[PDB]
Structure 1
Amino acid sequence: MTIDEIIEAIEKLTVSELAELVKKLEDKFGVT
């Protein structure tokens, strides 16, 4: 499934990349 494609991409990310993904999403949606 598509989400399974996204999950596999996320778990291949380094801990710095996961953190960058997290930082960006929260940023774009105005998170504090």
Structure 2
Amino acid sequence: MTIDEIIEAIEKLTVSELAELVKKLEDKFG
């Protein structure tokens, strides 16, 4: 996935899905 692609995928997530992505991003990084 290119960067523009990553952003495109994020825009398609539902709000529930976005919240899970954030939760995971925190765990894998901080």
TM-score bucket of the superposed structures, by smaller chain: 0.7 to 0.9
| Structure 1 ranges of 4+ moved more than 3 A | none
Q: Which runs of 5+ in 1 are unaligned?
A: none
> Shift of residue 28 of structure 1?
2.1
Q: Which runs of 5+ in 2 are unaligned?
A: none
CA-atom RMSD in angstroms: 1.7
Aligned residues: 30
Name the structure, 1 or 2, with higher relative contact order (CA <8 Å, separation 6+): 2
Give the fraction of aligned pairs with identical amino acids, expressed as a percent: 100
More helix by share: 2
> Shift of residue 29 of structure 1?
2.3
Q: Which has the higher Rg, Structure 1 or Structure 2?
A: 1
Distance 1:27 1:13 in 2: 19
**TM-score, normalising length: structure 1:** 0.76
